Amino acid sequence: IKELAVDEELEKEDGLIPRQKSKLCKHGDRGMCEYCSPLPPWDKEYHEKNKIKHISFHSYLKKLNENANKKENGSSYISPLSEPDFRINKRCHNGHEPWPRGICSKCQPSAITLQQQEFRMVDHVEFQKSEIINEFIQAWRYTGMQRFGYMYGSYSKYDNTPLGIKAVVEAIYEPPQHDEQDGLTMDVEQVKNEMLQIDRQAQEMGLSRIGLIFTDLSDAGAGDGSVFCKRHKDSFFLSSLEVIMAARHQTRHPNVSKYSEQGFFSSKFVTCVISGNLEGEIDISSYQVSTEAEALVTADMISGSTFPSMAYINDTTDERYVPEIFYMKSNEYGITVKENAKPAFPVDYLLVTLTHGFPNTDTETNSKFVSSTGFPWSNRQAMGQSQDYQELKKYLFNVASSGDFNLLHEKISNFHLLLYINSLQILSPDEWKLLIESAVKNEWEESLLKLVSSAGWQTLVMILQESG
Amino acid sequence: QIFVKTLTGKTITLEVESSDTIDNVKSKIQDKEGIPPDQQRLIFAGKQ
Numbered sequence: 001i002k003e004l005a006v007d008e009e010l011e012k013e014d015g016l017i018p019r020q021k022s023k024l025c026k027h028g029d030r031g032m033c034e035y036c037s038p039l040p041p042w043d044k045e046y047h048e049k050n051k052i053k054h055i056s057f058h059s060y061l062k063k064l065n066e067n068a069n070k071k072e073n074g075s076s077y078i079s080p081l082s083e084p085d086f087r088i089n090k091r092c093h094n095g096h097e098p099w100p101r102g103i104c105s106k107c108q109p110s111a112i113t114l115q116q117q118e119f120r121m122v123d124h125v126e127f128q129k130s131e132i133i134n135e136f137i138q139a140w141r142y143t144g145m146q147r148f149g150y151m152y153g154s155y156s157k158y159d160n161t162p163l164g165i166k167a168v169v170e171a172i173y174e175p176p177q178h179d180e181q182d183g184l185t186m187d188v189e190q191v192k193n194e195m196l197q198i199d200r201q202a203q204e205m206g207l208s209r210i211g212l213i214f215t216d217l218s219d220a221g222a223g224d225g226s227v228f229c230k231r232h233k234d235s236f237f238l239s240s241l242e243v244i245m246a247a248r249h250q251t252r253h254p255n256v257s258k259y260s261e262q263g264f265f266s267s268k269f270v271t272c273v274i275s276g277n278l279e280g281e282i283d284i285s286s287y288q289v290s291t292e293a294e295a296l297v298t299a300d301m302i303s304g305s306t307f308p309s310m311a312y313i314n315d316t317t318d319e320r321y322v323p324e325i326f327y328m329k330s331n332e333y334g335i336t337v338k339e340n341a342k343p344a345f346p347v348d349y350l351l352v353t354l355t356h357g358f359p360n361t362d363t364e365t366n367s368k369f370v371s372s373t374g375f376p377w378s379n380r381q382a383m384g385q386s387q388d389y390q391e392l393k394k395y396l397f398n399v400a401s402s403g404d405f406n407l408l409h410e411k412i413s414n415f416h417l418l419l420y421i422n423s424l425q426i427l428s429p430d431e432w433k434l435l436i437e438s439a440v441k442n443e444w445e446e447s448l449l450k451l452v453s454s455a456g457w458q459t460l461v462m463i464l465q466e467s468g
Numbered sequence: 469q470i471f472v473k474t475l476t477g478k479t480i481t482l483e484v485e486s487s488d489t490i491d492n493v494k495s496k497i498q499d500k501e502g503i504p505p506d507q508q509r510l511i512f513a514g515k516q
């Protein structure tokens with residue numbers, strides 16, 4: 001099987017950390033005893049020294065390869081990187097062949113200790129431009145209600161975190177949803193039918209749906225104060241209703257891995273939320289879900305509770321056997337061992353954090369999508385920017401009826417403009433594929449003149465001039 | 469003109485490895501981790 005091009009590059013590099021000679025070393029200069037030996041990239045002591053709170057899963061893959069492959073014979077190639085299962089094997093390899101009549105300890109799911117995950121799949125989410133997500137908050141500034149979107153992007157290496165993958169996003173697509181002041185809830189059938197055609201155009205453009213965003217602002221008084229502070233240390237970090245939508249999105253998009261026995265493991269999916277800081281701004285934060293316990297129990301046992309920090313655990317009806325969930329908390333006198341014989345266990349424990357950021361404006365490798373970021377988006381029907389062909393006379397117009405190719409190609413690289421053109425499918429699919437590849441790639445000057453000489457682009461500007 | 473001989477016996481250990489109270493993890497989430505060089509994080513304003 002074949003993995004991603006980014007995932008195979010992190011596997012080949014060892015990522016060792018070099019050290020220097022010290023006063024504690026008693027050996028010679030041409031050697032190393034223990035104090036200047038090469039440090040492994042999975043040691044968590046070096047991680048918390050530089051305030052890195054997770055061990056960068058590609059290095060966690062290396063720390064399990066040392067346990068799988070040894071100096072001894074072995075002759076196995078097991079590679080035990082699989083999803084730990086809480087479901088019940090029906091055959092059970094014993095005399096209690098039905099679960100209605102019989103269950104023993106080798107098939108019973110053990111009691112969940114609630115230990116936090118030490119490794120994250122995505123180590124650092126990054127963005128492309130501050131003007132891209134400024135249009136997303138501007139949707140709230142016009143209708144006053146919450147929004148929703150899906151993030152399309154790619155992946156590359158990250159040199160800050162040892163053996164880490166960074167998440168790059170390029171554009172944000174919004175599905176048609178019904179907004180509300182308190183929260184939001186849309187139909188999953190019309191979104192999945194709409195997201196199927198966007199994945200078609202994302203393949204030729206080199207994009208993949210790897211993220212989503214949802215807003216939560218609660219403006220205070222619209223004067224000096226920006227927003228309220230809903231999510232803090234004493235309150236919930238992520239609501240339990242949005243854990244369900246984050247869990248189903250990770251199971252729909254698996255990550256291919258040769259080390260896993262099933263063929264897919266350790267999904268690379270980000271969930272970002274606009275919530276605001278403690279003091280005064282609308283700074284965002286992102287956390288992703290845990291694979292070890294939460295990713296498998298969401299198929300059978302997650303039920304909604306009235307508290308945003310916790311989630312209710314329901315009962316067993318003849319196939320849905322669940323084990324007891326335990327966690328430690330302080331009582332009125334001291335700190336005690338596991339107490340939970342009670343439902344509504346918290347879900348903030350099962351989240352691992354990420355580091356969001358925006359790159360510097362002075363230099364970058366590329367940006368690939370900065371045309372205007374002011375074009376009316378596809379499914380923004382709550383706002384007034386959902387126009388017909390009247391917008392195409394205002395937006396591009398083949399500027400001033402005779403456009404220069406340095407000023408014409410800079411507008412054609414928009415994500416939602418190219419996704420609006422092919423829906424009319426005036427051009428051929430072969431000429432459309434070279435149209436979107438010219439706008440997204442470099443050395444575009446020889447191929448842009450091929451587009452203007454084609455009869456399909458001439459019919460597009462002729463059918464636009466007669467219409468309003 | 470005689471002797472006294474007696475042996476001994478030991479029990480080594482058991483462990484549980486229980487840690488990570490919930491109040492330490494809630495303080496563990498709300499912090500920062502550092503950002504390379506020019507990876508500003510931004511502010512924003514609106515809703516006049």
Ligand SMILES: [Zn+2]
Binds near residue numbers: 027031035037
């Ligand atoms: Zn040494």
Ligand SMILES: [Zn+2]
Binds near residue numbers: 094
């Ligand atoms: Zn069994």
